[PDB]
Enzyme design. Structure first.
Site: not given
Lengths: 699, 700, 146, 35, 40
Positions: B675, B555, B643
């Site tokens: 995610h 991320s 996502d």
């Protein structure tokens, strides 16, 4: 009103039922001691229409010889998927088997984590695992390094003739016939013994079992040198073993290396339930000397492992031994039965109309009753371990409870102190009593004389001259009604009815002479016994003779068909589920063909052929002969997927009654077996029966 | 060998993880002495059927007054299936369980060894599915133990097509309308409502009085059972994600059972959360966040007196460091039981630098005392406190989670606490971990805030051989931190001969409010240099090969790793990233948190925002795709279709650029994954792929 | 789609001419649609630049793309609008219509959005095609007349 | 329409078409085998 | 051999069976006439 009956049924079906109990390892503190009791309960849930199973745990503080304190140690936790479960002898690990298409997994737990999990389907070594009581088992090795179970044997792969393959299965053998064991044992042709190694995960199927027997109830021999099991003969044919103990069996011992088995008992009789002593020196088992009846008095046989000597501890009781013992009628011994001293055996058995707990000394061969006296009630031994006994108690007025106690030393076993664990709220508007009845000399048996029977009467406690009565005889025909908790007789007594439970001659708990009387002459003796009981009960000036109904099932349905055929004007209503109507037609299509021959009075043999006298006697015994004189309303409930009794019998009875223009109502459940045990069908049948009775008799 | 790593992963994944714990009613014996039962729920990963299993366990505690005489187990672990919510009665006699068994949801009431009542919520047709998440979901018992309160989805009108045939009140043409949801992991959760169930008669009532522009959640019964106190979240003009963000507008409301307008118990201009009622039913305490710019910051502990209706502040914002043991409150959710028996002290936990400790605060006079100070490290976590008995868990990078119980001593003696173990965990004696403090050079020093420093955690094998490969990984967030807790992957890497570095750069929590407000505005050129400085400083220690350094991220860690491999191509030899951010400008349109990119880029976020050419120029300057041409490091990518936070097209654009540049890359794409990448199968596959990728390029 | 593109311009530049509008899968922002699309060369050619395999963002190219997008004239729209989008669309993402809807909703102008969970660019399914046609007919009849 | 086709040989003894290419089989690391 | 029997059975089962038949309307041309037969 249907709403009131539905509400009352919903209220009464909320009582949980106890299934199993076990004792945990002992824990000492800096100097009191305590241990834990793990109990499994089950209950009916009408919202989901299913039977739910949950676990609960209790805590016992004892000084060593007496129980000081006992109390709950948590909440109830609902489980789903477990088929078998077994704790280690030391109490450290636990082995579970659960299903989750569906697959089966074997799990090994230690403390707060799952040590191991094996996918038995993927290894492709055997078939599905047996979870039934007849064959299923799960045993730990003494070293706690191996596991033993019973699984279905693997069959060769099959293929069709016209099969396409991409550019070792036999072609044309995918529709062969494999014989199962009978009712409630579908697709259970032949089992095998499997041993799993926890350390490495290997699975090995033992070799040395005879090719003509089926193994079951296997446990590890002392020293982990082999396996001792019970072999059932399955040649030439397979006869149903559900509720039947007259099947050939033997005790065998087979080594792990692979070799010829040995015999530890006579092969001409039936044996059951081998149990090993805690000091690993003696074995006890149940032996049945005859194969004619499907239930009879057994005897307790003792085998010494080192001296290889067999003896008899408890023998057959003809009529009555002393005043509290009447023989052993339980097919299965408790999993834990031996005492700490490994010299006494504790069991439970029915005595007349009540079930009691007995302790037998292996050396002297003397039987002592722990729960003698009192008004009644039925006891059931759940477990014993290190002289701590966990038992269950219930009467027709109270739901099942739970109790614990300590087994006192030899010679002082009458004084036992019971400490409650989970009490049940009683119902104080139900009264129950036992009435003893003596048959008149006209219908007295010739070979056996002086035999009597007894009945159980349920009536409301508050007396308001017009009380409807309901009569129901037990099935069997070698079975008994004990003073335990029954849901439907309790439901009927809360709607203003009075219920009479009849235990005619030929029932268990009264001796071996009473059992042998009924063979050969079923159809006129028990009918007259039931009618005499009904007349004697109605003699008192408290019940309305105009309003009398009846209930039945299987053999009870047979007895009810006979009763309404022979005494048309006595009864005003009738409810029957899965009856027997024609024995002659039943002979061809049933999983226990020897039952017809034994009940009709003819010896059963494998080479059996039709004869005119046999068929004439069978047609004489059947109640279909009395069909034209029936004039009472009738309700039939049948299960289509039934193996014990085909529904064509009930259909023929329905057709015969329908052609005569007598009222009759038929219900057919398409996917139910002989038990009718599914929650939906059971509730539907009970509601239909109670509504029918209320309509045809009154509120 | 791949088989060696598969066996190593199988061994480390069987350690269970603690989820929740509760205390039962107190039982006294006739002879003397009292004891209690502790019910704990654990979870575990099972690779045979690839699922997370949940089980329950019971423990027994013998205490004589204010000391724990004895503690032990009281049974075996029992596996449960399909249980969503559970709540025990305040007295302890009954337990309410909401479970699922098409599928339907049932509400069950248990007393002793039987199930008293069961309700089918689907058939009654009063609302929709029941919320079981942490932010909105709740299950509360009335003080009379006669009613139940929960939160459920609002019911929508029936719809039908224009050409439906009828045999011879559903609106036609409205079966494909758009209903907005709250974002990530909150699909089809548009509008919740508060439902009250009556145990005696089985009646369900939907409360009226909630404002039409708010969503209610975290409701509990007011003292005297006169009403309901809840937290309202604003959902106009449109919704924003709330998965890991505490900067969403909220307020405290109190509504009556009869109806009418709802009162306000707090200021509506800021965010509030976690209201807890005192055991004597006289005071309420909650968390308040004064700003909406960052997604994580220091909070305040606000106290409200019910009968006087006056609000005060107990714990205030800590700029840099208050004392030597306290740095602020960084936990969004308070424990379910936090008040002490005296109803005058509050016990909580929060990160402090790279640690996690337990703090107790006196409500009458603001004073914070650290219960667990000193020692080498560790991360404590509070689970429950009831009648001054606290149940906590403890773990370090070397040991798995444990379980402990203790008694809270009176005021003035809280430093001396005795802990009694309940379930120990076997340690791993071949892992060594240490903490290193790093000071940035004067050139890369913030103008507004000066003197700020950061730190890192180093994991190395104890059996020292001169050449040890290193794996460096920065945290996500970017307002988040690594505490000295038990992490599976860094432990697995250290068992294969690697040495792991965990950097907590400037901008992480646990260091003060001044460190939070430093990273906003300048992102992509301050933290990258901090990580590079850490890596350069660590390499000075001997027995560390400078030619074998790998990089791991995810991320925002993927953002940092893309920046690092784009700006320092020759330092690192392998990189692994999961769901990275590649182009901030493109991510603005398609995301559930559009304010994140605006705030991090340095521009204030407002509704009805319009694109401006100056704004786009700044966004493209900070993106790691600018340095894409000068990348010569092998790369492994991991993406998920489903996502909502970071779309998977960013990694695809990076992959296309690198593929056109003829650079060895590998892409793994999971058709159904969010995610988190939290499913057991995909998690195991991704971890195995990362391990096999790192070993090839560096070594065994 | 592309016609919807034109439609998004027509109400943007001539607000008072038209009384209603119906669009299906429109293009709102060329700059954002470049990255997430299966034909990235459509954006360069229509904007006036030459597509190449090695293509990187440039401020001039982004300015040219943002100059031609119909989202520039969004604050001046005052016409009722009906939007129809499908999730499983690879030609034109459904986030463009969502951004246009958000911008219009923030301005308090009537707008109705329909979203089909499983539909491609064509919307060529008997249920969804009939539903969309019926909705468009009812919208046009309501806002104009019989 | 763009790729698909079905063609007859002139001798009318063979058929020609277009089909997706076959991919190698795959499995997970933690896969149990029937040993 | 089973393969020969399977092949022979596959060959013999290829023959179809006539289930139904019907006659259609009559059509005249400028001067013969014809009709159609539909068989199942």
């Amino acid at each position: 009103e249907p709403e009131e009956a539905a509400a009352l049924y919903r209220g009464l079906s909320r009582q949980p039922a106890l299934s199993a109990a076990c004792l945990g390892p002992e824990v000492t503190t800096q100097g009191g001691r305590y241990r834990t009791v793990h109990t499994e309960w089950t209950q009916r849930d009408l919202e989901r229409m299913e039977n739910i199973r949950f676990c609960r745990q209790y805590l016992v503080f004892h000084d060593g010889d007496s129980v000081v304190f006992a109390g709950p140690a948590g909440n109830s936790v609902e489980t789903r998927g477990e088929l078998l479960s077994r704790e280690s002898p030391s109490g450290t690990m636990k082995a579970v088997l659960r299903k989750a298409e569906e697959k089966q997994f074997l799990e090994v737990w230690e403390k707060n984590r799952k040590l191991k999990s094996f996918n038995l389907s993927a290894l492709e070594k055997h078939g599905p695992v047996y979870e039934d009581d007849c064959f299923g088992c799960l045993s730990w090795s003494h070293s706690e390094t191996h596991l033993l179970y019973v699984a279905d044997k693997k069959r060769p792969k099959a293929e069709s003739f016209f099969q396409t393959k991409a550019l070792q299965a036999i072609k044309g053998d995918q529709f062969l016939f494999y014989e199962d064991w009978g009712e409630n044992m579908v697709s259970k042709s032949t089992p095998v013994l499997c041993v799993l190694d926890i350390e490495s995960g290997n699975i090995s199927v033992l070799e040395g079992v005879p090719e003509s027997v089926s193994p079951g109830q296997a446990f590890w021999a002392p020293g982990d040198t082999g396996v001792v099991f019970v072999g059932w003969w399955h040649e030439p044919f397979r006869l149903g073993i559900r509720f039947c103990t007259n099947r050939r069996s033997a005790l065998y011992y087979v080594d792990l290396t692979g070799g010829k088995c040995e015999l530890l008992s006579d092969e001409s009789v039936a044996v059951t339930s081998p149990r090993l002593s805690p000091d690993q020196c003696r074995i006890v088992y149940l032996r049945f000397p005859s194969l004619v009846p499907h239930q009879q008095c057994g005897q307790l046989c003792l085998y010494d492992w080192y001296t290889r000597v067999t003896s008899v501890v408890v023998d057959i009781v003809p009529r009555q031994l002393g005043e509290d013992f009447s023989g052993i009628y339980c097919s299965l011994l408790p999993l834990g039965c031996w005492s700490a001293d490994s010299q006494r055996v504790v069991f439970d058995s029915p005595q007349r109309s009540r079930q009691d707990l007995f302790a037998v000394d292996t050396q002297m061969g003397s039987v002592t009753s722990l729960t003698a006296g009192g008004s009644g009630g039925s006891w059931k031994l759940l477990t014993i371990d290190r002289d701590l006994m966990v038992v269950q108690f219930s009467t027709p007025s109270v739901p099942p409870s739970l109790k614990v106690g300590f087994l006192p030393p030899a010679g002082k076993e009458q004084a036992v102190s019971w400490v409650s664990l989970e009490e049940a709220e009683p119902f104080p508007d139900i009264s129950w009593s036992i009435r003893v009845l003596q048959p008149p000399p006209q219908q007295e048996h010739v070979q056996y004389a002086g035999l009597d029977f007894e009945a159980i009467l349920l009536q409301p406690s508050n007396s308001p001259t017009q009380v409807p009565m309901v009569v129901m005889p037990h099935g069997g025909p070698h079975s008994s009604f004990v003073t335990a908790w029954m849901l439907f007789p309790a439901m009927l007594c809360k709607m203003g009815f009075a219920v009479l439970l009849v235990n005619y001659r030929g029932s268990t708990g009264f001796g071996q002479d009473s059992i042998l009387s009924l063979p050969g002459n079923v159809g006129h003796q028990d009918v007259k016994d039931v009618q005499f009981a009904v007349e004697q009960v109605l003699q008192e000036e408290h019940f309305d003779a105009g309003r009398v109904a009846l209930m039945g099932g299987s053999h009870g349905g047979f007895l009810s068909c006979h009763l309404i055929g022979q005494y048309p004007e006595t009864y005003s209503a009738c409810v029957v589920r899965n009856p027997v109507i024609n024995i002659a037609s039943m002979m061809g299509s049933t999983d226990i063909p020897d039952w017809c021959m034994v009940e009709a009075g003819f010896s059963y043999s494998s080479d059996c052929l039709p004869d005119l006298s046999v068929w004439a006697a069978m047609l004489d015994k059947s109640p279909i002969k009395y069909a034209p004189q029936v004039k009472t309303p009738l309700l039939l409930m049948l299960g289509q997927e039934d193996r014990r009794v085909p529904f064509k019998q009930g259909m023929e009875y329905y057709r015969v009654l329908k052609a005569r223009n007598v009222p009759v109502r038929l219900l057919l459940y398409p996917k139910s077996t002989h038990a009718l045990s599914e929650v939906e069908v059971e509730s539907d049948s009970f509601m239909n029966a109670v509504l029918w009775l209320c309509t045809h008799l009154g509120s």
